[PDB]
């Protein structure tokens, strides 16, 4: 109650920091898109603004932005990699011919050239401080740092206007919440492939791409009620986004405190975002998200997330047979360790939230 409202107040973004950040990001991004379009392989590239900033669920500071540089590949032919449900080979039924490795459009080759053109172009921005960060972790994105403060993740994304792959057939269970008619409209939209590679033993299948529905996630978060006027009037202010912000802060704070020995490195904000969409499906009515039930609604989010950890099950919201919490990705010790830390916080009314 009083305690969670105080935390939400602290996580609010300053209008002044938003104004300055948005100006700086949009200028660097609009420039790189202009420049990339001069390469014959990237002529049709377009921008999509995605992730927590554009979903209005970014917490603490506007210091991390996400953008997709999307490219329509017509006549695209997909082959699921090794029953992974989320990872695919891309084949054709000319423009990208330089990135072919046999019949296969190589994600690694396309990503290397994308990164190379961006790296060359930022070095000829003279008006503004822009560096590229080192290639770190499993991200499909190239990461920039603007004026030593603002991180920008830019992912290449192939756009397919074809029907979503079969692995999404039982995904996006929004019928009871956002309606069947909305599920149908959303599935008529394109889907994206980003250069995140399937695991292969010690290594990776450097050719493979992964499905992305970041654009659908944004549409859902910014149009998130059963009521079309959800959060447009002081009588319909739900706590859905407040719950997701508090879950993000719970995870960020535990990861910071356990930095000494880094037990929580496999966990990411996308784990709490996925878990949150599942609680939305379970609790489809706006009356299950009344501002006056914030503490209960937060508890619903914490308890589902604890069940996900204990059961080692957290389905991708779009691809049900893709388990983000399988032992292939996160070891059992790491899940039991996060379970123990979140139980403690739940049992002591979230001391990690004091200061
Ligand atoms: C940029 C951008 O714009 N739209 C989407 C988009 C975007 O990042 C993705 C898309 N589509 C995407 O898939 N990112 C992603 N995927 C896997 C992973 S991990 C934890 O490695 O498995 C990560 C990731 C890696 C390190 C830190 C971190 F915080 C996240 N990031
Ligand atoms: N493992 C993943 N699988 C699928 N999509 C992912 C994955 N990780 C990130 N994404 C997509 O990329 C977007 C940007 O990811 P990022 O890590 O920046 O998180 P975010 O949602 O922006 O939240 P924050 O940046 O505040 O932690 C996500 O919102 C999601 O659409
Ligand atoms: Mg982000
Ligand atoms: Mg990011
Ligand atoms: Zn609302």
mmCIF file with all atom_site columns, C-alpha atoms in Angstrom, residues 48-188:
data_model
loop_
_atom_site.group_PDB
_atom_site.id
_atom_site.type_symbol
_atom_site.label_atom_id
_atom_site.label_alt_id
_atom_site.label_comp_id
_atom_site.label_asym_id
_atom_site.label_entity_id
_atom_site.label_seq_id
_atom_site.pdbx_PDB_ins_code
_atom_site.Cartn_x
_atom_site.Cartn_y
_atom_site.Cartn_z
_atom_site.occupancy
_atom_site.B_iso_or_equiv
_atom_site.pdbx_formal_charge
_atom_site.auth_seq_id
_atom_site.auth_comp_id
_atom_site.auth_asym_id
_atom_site.auth_atom_id
_atom_site.pdbx_PDB_model_num
ATOM 1   C CA . UNK A 1 48  ? 10.274  0.525   -34.987 1.00 0.00 ? 48  UNK A CA 1
ATOM 2   C CA . UNK A 1 49  ? 10.504  1.999   -31.429 1.00 0.00 ? 49  UNK A CA 1
ATOM 3   C CA . UNK A 1 50  ? 10.189  -0.904  -28.925 1.00 0.00 ? 50  UNK A CA 1
ATOM 4   C CA . UNK A 1 51  ? 11.003  -1.951  -25.343 1.00 0.00 ? 51  UNK A CA 1
ATOM 5   C CA . UNK A 1 52  ? 10.257  -0.362  -21.970 1.00 0.00 ? 52  UNK A CA 1
ATOM 6   C CA . UNK A 1 53  ? 10.768  3.319   -22.900 1.00 0.00 ? 53  UNK A CA 1
ATOM 7   C CA . UNK A 1 54  ? 8.075   3.302   -25.666 1.00 0.00 ? 54  UNK A CA 1
ATOM 8   C CA . UNK A 1 55  ? 5.833   1.003   -23.478 1.00 0.00 ? 55  UNK A CA 1
ATOM 9   C CA . UNK A 1 56  ? 6.030   3.646   -20.663 1.00 0.00 ? 56  UNK A CA 1
ATOM 10  C CA . UNK A 1 57  ? 7.376   0.994   -18.204 1.00 0.00 ? 57  UNK A CA 1
ATOM 11  C CA . UNK A 1 58  ? 11.066  2.131   -18.158 1.00 0.00 ? 58  UNK A CA 1
ATOM 12  C CA . UNK A 1 59  ? 12.015  2.727   -14.479 1.00 0.00 ? 59  UNK A CA 1
ATOM 13  C CA . UNK A 1 60  ? 14.345  5.139   -12.577 1.00 0.00 ? 60  UNK A CA 1
ATOM 14  C CA . UNK A 1 61  ? 15.978  6.896   -15.612 1.00 0.00 ? 61  UNK A CA 1
ATOM 15  C CA . UNK A 1 62  ? 15.409  7.151   -19.388 1.00 0.00 ? 62  UNK A CA 1
ATOM 16  C CA . UNK A 1 63  ? 18.958  5.689   -19.943 1.00 0.00 ? 63  UNK A CA 1
ATOM 17  C CA . UNK A 1 64  ? 18.135  2.592   -22.182 1.00 0.00 ? 64  UNK A CA 1
ATOM 18  C CA . UNK A 1 65  ? 16.183  2.700   -25.494 1.00 0.00 ? 65  UNK A CA 1
ATOM 19  C CA . UNK A 1 66  ? 15.469  -0.153  -27.970 1.00 0.00 ? 66  UNK A CA 1
ATOM 20  C CA . UNK A 1 67  ? 14.870  0.181   -31.714 1.00 0.00 ? 67  UNK A CA 1
ATOM 21  C CA . UNK A 1 68  ? 14.372  -2.321  -34.573 1.00 0.00 ? 68  UNK A CA 1
ATOM 22  C CA . UNK A 1 69  ? 15.837  -1.560  -38.039 1.00 0.00 ? 69  UNK A CA 1
ATOM 23  C CA . UNK A 1 70  ? 13.275  -3.763  -39.951 1.00 0.00 ? 70  UNK A CA 1
ATOM 24  C CA . UNK A 1 71  ? 13.807  -4.932  -43.592 1.00 0.00 ? 71  UNK A CA 1
ATOM 25  C CA . UNK A 1 72  ? 11.019  -6.588  -45.649 1.00 0.00 ? 72  UNK A CA 1
ATOM 26  C CA . UNK A 1 73  ? 12.275  -9.858  -47.264 1.00 0.00 ? 73  UNK A CA 1
ATOM 27  C CA . UNK A 1 74  ? 9.442   -10.935 -49.614 1.00 0.00 ? 74  UNK A CA 1
ATOM 28  C CA . UNK A 1 75  ? 9.216   -14.636 -50.752 1.00 0.00 ? 75  UNK A CA 1
ATOM 29  C CA . UNK A 1 76  ? 10.940  -15.654 -47.427 1.00 0.00 ? 76  UNK A CA 1
ATOM 30  C CA . UNK A 1 77  ? 11.066  -19.426 -46.637 1.00 0.00 ? 77  UNK A CA 1
ATOM 31  C CA . UNK A 1 78  ? 11.480  -20.503 -42.954 1.00 0.00 ? 78  UNK A CA 1
ATOM 32  C CA . UNK A 1 79  ? 12.884  -23.795 -41.614 1.00 0.00 ? 79  UNK A CA 1
ATOM 33  C CA . UNK A 1 80  ? 12.557  -24.406 -37.826 1.00 0.00 ? 80  UNK A CA 1
ATOM 34  C CA . UNK A 1 81  ? 16.003  -25.271 -36.368 1.00 0.00 ? 81  UNK A CA 1
ATOM 35  C CA . UNK A 1 82  ? 16.163  -28.591 -34.398 1.00 0.00 ? 82  UNK A CA 1
ATOM 36  C CA . UNK A 1 83  ? 12.560  -28.362 -32.952 1.00 0.00 ? 83  UNK A CA 1
ATOM 37  C CA . UNK A 1 84  ? 13.555  -25.173 -30.949 1.00 0.00 ? 84  UNK A CA 1
ATOM 38  C CA . UNK A 1 85  ? 10.151  -23.528 -31.916 1.00 0.00 ? 85  UNK A CA 1
ATOM 39  C CA . UNK A 1 86  ? 11.726  -19.979 -31.684 1.00 0.00 ? 86  UNK A CA 1
ATOM 40  C CA . UNK A 1 87  ? 14.860  -20.387 -33.942 1.00 0.00 ? 87  UNK A CA 1
ATOM 41  C CA . UNK A 1 88  ? 14.765  -20.632 -37.760 1.00 0.00 ? 88  UNK A CA 1
ATOM 42  C CA . UNK A 1 89  ? 16.876  -20.811 -40.889 1.00 0.00 ? 89  UNK A CA 1
ATOM 43  C CA . UNK A 1 90  ? 15.926  -18.205 -43.544 1.00 0.00 ? 90  UNK A CA 1
ATOM 44  C CA . UNK A 1 91  ? 15.870  -19.383 -47.232 1.00 0.00 ? 91  UNK A CA 1
ATOM 45  C CA . UNK A 1 92  ? 14.324  -17.865 -50.451 1.00 0.00 ? 92  UNK A CA 1
ATOM 46  C CA . UNK A 1 93  ? 11.552  -19.141 -52.856 1.00 0.00 ? 93  UNK A CA 1
ATOM 47  C CA . UNK A 1 94  ? 19.327  -11.388 -54.983 1.00 0.00 ? 94  UNK A CA 1
ATOM 48  C CA . UNK A 1 95  ? 19.540  -8.232  -52.768 1.00 0.00 ? 95  UNK A CA 1
ATOM 49  C CA . UNK A 1 96  ? 20.992  -10.169 -49.748 1.00 0.00 ? 96  UNK A CA 1
ATOM 50  C CA . UNK A 1 97  ? 22.994  -12.639 -51.991 1.00 0.00 ? 97  UNK A CA 1
ATOM 51  C CA . UNK A 1 98  ? 26.276  -11.584 -50.234 1.00 0.00 ? 98  UNK A CA 1
ATOM 52  C CA . UNK A 1 99  ? 24.972  -13.140 -46.917 1.00 0.00 ? 99  UNK A CA 1
ATOM 53  C CA . UNK A 1 100 ? 24.077  -16.591 -48.395 1.00 0.00 ? 100 UNK A CA 1
ATOM 54  C CA . UNK A 1 101 ? 25.999  -19.582 -46.905 1.00 0.00 ? 101 UNK A CA 1
ATOM 55  C CA . UNK A 1 102 ? 24.624  -22.257 -49.280 1.00 0.00 ? 102 UNK A CA 1
ATOM 56  C CA . UNK A 1 103 ? 20.782  -22.030 -49.564 1.00 0.00 ? 103 UNK A CA 1
ATOM 57  C CA . UNK A 1 104 ? 20.746  -20.262 -46.107 1.00 0.00 ? 104 UNK A CA 1
ATOM 58  C CA . UNK A 1 105 ? 20.703  -16.459 -45.388 1.00 0.00 ? 105 UNK A CA 1
ATOM 59  C CA . UNK A 1 106 ? 23.329  -16.367 -42.541 1.00 0.00 ? 106 UNK A CA 1
ATOM 60  C CA . UNK A 1 107 ? 22.266  -14.338 -39.458 1.00 0.00 ? 107 UNK A CA 1
ATOM 61  C CA . UNK A 1 108 ? 26.002  -14.037 -38.403 1.00 0.00 ? 108 UNK A CA 1
ATOM 62  C CA . UNK A 1 109 ? 27.105  -12.577 -41.818 1.00 0.00 ? 109 UNK A CA 1
ATOM 63  C CA . UNK A 1 110 ? 24.125  -10.168 -42.030 1.00 0.00 ? 110 UNK A CA 1
ATOM 64  C CA . UNK A 1 111 ? 24.747  -9.061  -38.376 1.00 0.00 ? 111 UNK A CA 1
ATOM 65  C CA . UNK A 1 112 ? 28.545  -8.539  -38.964 1.00 0.00 ? 112 UNK A CA 1
ATOM 66  C CA . UNK A 1 113 ? 27.910  -6.179  -41.966 1.00 0.00 ? 113 UNK A CA 1
ATOM 67  C CA . UNK A 1 114 ? 25.030  -4.371  -40.101 1.00 0.00 ? 114 UNK A CA 1
ATOM 68  C CA . UNK A 1 115 ? 27.427  -3.795  -37.140 1.00 0.00 ? 115 UNK A CA 1
ATOM 69  C CA . UNK A 1 116 ? 30.307  -2.754  -39.483 1.00 0.00 ? 116 UNK A CA 1
ATOM 70  C CA . UNK A 1 117 ? 28.199  -0.056  -41.320 1.00 0.00 ? 117 UNK A CA 1
ATOM 71  C CA . UNK A 1 118 ? 26.899  1.374   -37.946 1.00 0.00 ? 118 UNK A CA 1
ATOM 72  C CA . UNK A 1 119 ? 30.453  1.398   -36.415 1.00 0.00 ? 119 UNK A CA 1
ATOM 73  C CA . UNK A 1 120 ? 31.820  3.276   -39.503 1.00 0.00 ? 120 UNK A CA 1
ATOM 74  C CA . UNK A 1 121 ? 28.868  5.771   -39.526 1.00 0.00 ? 121 UNK A CA 1
ATOM 75  C CA . UNK A 1 122 ? 28.926  6.710   -35.763 1.00 0.00 ? 122 UNK A CA 1
ATOM 76  C CA . UNK A 1 123 ? 32.671  7.633   -36.164 1.00 0.00 ? 123 UNK A CA 1
ATOM 77  C CA . UNK A 1 124 ? 31.589  10.312  -38.768 1.00 0.00 ? 124 UNK A CA 1
ATOM 78  C CA . UNK A 1 125 ? 29.010  11.787  -36.310 1.00 0.00 ? 125 UNK A CA 1
ATOM 79  C CA . UNK A 1 126 ? 31.087  14.819  -35.116 1.00 0.00 ? 126 UNK A CA 1
ATOM 80  C CA . UNK A 1 127 ? 28.216  17.012  -33.667 1.00 0.00 ? 127 UNK A CA 1
ATOM 81  C CA . UNK A 1 128 ? 27.510  14.460  -30.818 1.00 0.00 ? 128 UNK A CA 1
ATOM 82  C CA . UNK A 1 129 ? 29.394  11.977  -28.521 1.00 0.00 ? 129 UNK A CA 1
ATOM 83  C CA . UNK A 1 130 ? 28.438  8.421   -29.803 1.00 0.00 ? 130 UNK A CA 1
ATOM 84  C CA . UNK A 1 131 ? 30.486  5.195   -29.169 1.00 0.00 ? 131 UNK A CA 1
ATOM 85  C CA . UNK A 1 132 ? 29.597  1.512   -29.929 1.00 0.00 ? 132 UNK A CA 1
ATOM 86  C CA . UNK A 1 133 ? 29.798  -0.756  -26.807 1.00 0.00 ? 133 UNK A CA 1
ATOM 87  C CA . UNK A 1 134 ? 31.672  -4.108  -27.036 1.00 0.00 ? 134 UNK A CA 1
ATOM 88  C CA . UNK A 1 135 ? 29.699  -7.138  -28.379 1.00 0.00 ? 135 UNK A CA 1
ATOM 89  C CA . UNK A 1 136 ? 28.555  -8.481  -24.927 1.00 0.00 ? 136 UNK A CA 1
ATOM 90  C CA . UNK A 1 137 ? 26.287  -11.485 -24.093 1.00 0.00 ? 137 UNK A CA 1
ATOM 91  C CA . UNK A 1 138 ? 23.607  -13.104 -26.285 1.00 0.00 ? 138 UNK A CA 1
ATOM 92  C CA . UNK A 1 139 ? 21.935  -9.904  -27.714 1.00 0.00 ? 139 UNK A CA 1
ATOM 93  C CA . UNK A 1 140 ? 20.891  -9.666  -31.364 1.00 0.00 ? 140 UNK A CA 1
ATOM 94  C CA . UNK A 1 141 ? 21.452  -5.861  -30.976 1.00 0.00 ? 141 UNK A CA 1
ATOM 95  C CA . UNK A 1 142 ? 24.337  -3.469  -31.639 1.00 0.00 ? 142 UNK A CA 1
ATOM 96  C CA . UNK A 1 143 ? 24.605  -1.204  -28.521 1.00 0.00 ? 143 UNK A CA 1
ATOM 97  C CA . UNK A 1 144 ? 25.528  2.542   -28.685 1.00 0.00 ? 144 UNK A CA 1
ATOM 98  C CA . UNK A 1 145 ? 26.259  4.904   -25.759 1.00 0.00 ? 145 UNK A CA 1
ATOM 99  C CA . UNK A 1 146 ? 25.268  8.569   -26.436 1.00 0.00 ? 146 UNK A CA 1
ATOM 100 C CA . UNK A 1 147 ? 26.982  11.370  -24.329 1.00 0.00 ? 147 UNK A CA 1
ATOM 101 C CA . UNK A 1 148 ? 28.459  8.665   -21.967 1.00 0.00 ? 148 UNK A CA 1
ATOM 102 C CA . UNK A 1 149 ? 24.935  8.102   -20.429 1.00 0.00 ? 149 UNK A CA 1
ATOM 103 C CA . UNK A 1 150 ? 22.185  6.830   -22.835 1.00 0.00 ? 150 UNK A CA 1
ATOM 104 C CA . UNK A 1 151 ? 22.373  3.179   -24.026 1.00 0.00 ? 151 UNK A CA 1
ATOM 105 C CA . UNK A 1 152 ? 20.590  2.459   -27.395 1.00 0.00 ? 152 UNK A CA 1
ATOM 106 C CA . UNK A 1 153 ? 20.118  -1.191  -28.567 1.00 0.00 ? 153 UNK A CA 1
ATOM 107 C CA . UNK A 1 154 ? 19.570  -1.380  -32.374 1.00 0.00 ? 154 UNK A CA 1
ATOM 108 C CA . UNK A 1 155 ? 18.543  -4.822  -33.717 1.00 0.00 ? 155 UNK A CA 1
ATOM 109 C CA . UNK A 1 156 ? 18.387  -5.727  -37.365 1.00 0.00 ? 156 UNK A CA 1
ATOM 110 C CA . UNK A 1 157 ? 15.037  -7.496  -38.043 1.00 0.00 ? 157 UNK A CA 1
ATOM 111 C CA . UNK A 1 158 ? 13.788  -9.251  -41.202 1.00 0.00 ? 158 UNK A CA 1
ATOM 112 C CA . UNK A 1 159 ? 10.044  -8.543  -41.663 1.00 0.00 ? 159 UNK A CA 1
ATOM 113 C CA . UNK A 1 160 ? 7.739   -11.335 -43.003 1.00 0.00 ? 160 UNK A CA 1
ATOM 114 C CA . UNK A 1 161 ? 4.162   -10.358 -43.996 1.00 0.00 ? 161 UNK A CA 1
ATOM 115 C CA . UNK A 1 162 ? 3.342   -14.138 -44.117 1.00 0.00 ? 162 UNK A CA 1
ATOM 116 C CA . UNK A 1 163 ? 1.211   -15.904 -41.466 1.00 0.00 ? 163 UNK A CA 1
ATOM 117 C CA . UNK A 1 164 ? 3.074   -16.394 -38.138 1.00 0.00 ? 164 UNK A CA 1
ATOM 118 C CA . UNK A 1 165 ? 4.984   -19.737 -37.867 1.00 0.00 ? 165 UNK A CA 1
ATOM 119 C CA . UNK A 1 166 ? 2.971   -22.782 -36.601 1.00 0.00 ? 166 UNK A CA 1
ATOM 120 C CA . UNK A 1 167 ? 4.793   -22.643 -33.187 1.00 0.00 ? 167 UNK A CA 1
ATOM 121 C CA . UNK A 1 168 ? 2.689   -19.454 -32.433 1.00 0.00 ? 168 UNK A CA 1
ATOM 122 C CA . UNK A 1 169 ? -0.672  -21.207 -33.109 1.00 0.00 ? 169 UNK A CA 1
ATOM 123 C CA . UNK A 1 170 ? -1.484  -21.649 -29.348 1.00 0.00 ? 170 UNK A CA 1
ATOM 124 C CA . UNK A 1 171 ? 0.383   -18.422 -28.255 1.00 0.00 ? 171 UNK A CA 1
ATOM 125 C CA . UNK A 1 172 ? -0.955  -14.881 -27.457 1.00 0.00 ? 172 UNK A CA 1
ATOM 126 C CA . UNK A 1 173 ? -3.861  -16.131 -25.235 1.00 0.00 ? 173 UNK A CA 1
ATOM 127 C CA . UNK A 1 174 ? -5.524  -12.646 -25.018 1.00 0.00 ? 174 UNK A CA 1
ATOM 128 C CA . UNK A 1 175 ? -9.108  -13.683 -26.113 1.00 0.00 ? 175 UNK A CA 1
ATOM 129 C CA . UNK A 1 176 ? -10.574 -13.338 -22.541 1.00 0.00 ? 176 UNK A CA 1
ATOM 130 C CA . UNK A 1 177 ? -8.629  -10.097 -21.894 1.00 0.00 ? 177 UNK A CA 1
ATOM 131 C CA . UNK A 1 178 ? -8.138  -8.026  -25.122 1.00 0.00 ? 178 UNK A CA 1
ATOM 132 C CA . UNK A 1 179 ? -10.711 -10.082 -27.195 1.00 0.00 ? 179 UNK A CA 1
ATOM 133 C CA . UNK A 1 180 ? -10.695 -12.616 -30.070 1.00 0.00 ? 180 UNK A CA 1
ATOM 134 C CA . UNK A 1 181 ? -11.176 -9.839  -32.660 1.00 0.00 ? 181 UNK A CA 1
ATOM 135 C CA . UNK A 1 182 ? -7.923  -8.166  -31.328 1.00 0.00 ? 182 UNK A CA 1
ATOM 136 C CA . UNK A 1 183 ? -6.017  -11.506 -31.364 1.00 0.00 ? 183 UNK A CA 1
ATOM 137 C CA . UNK A 1 184 ? -7.061  -11.894 -35.037 1.00 0.00 ? 184 UNK A CA 1
ATOM 138 C CA . UNK A 1 185 ? -6.007  -8.297  -35.996 1.00 0.00 ? 185 UNK A CA 1
ATOM 139 C CA . UNK A 1 186 ? -2.612  -8.731  -34.208 1.00 0.00 ? 186 UNK A CA 1
ATOM 140 C CA . UNK A 1 187 ? -1.851  -12.070 -36.049 1.00 0.00 ? 187 UNK A CA 1
ATOM 141 C CA . UNK A 1 188 ? -2.580  -10.353 -39.452 1.00 0.00 ? 188 UNK A CA 1
#
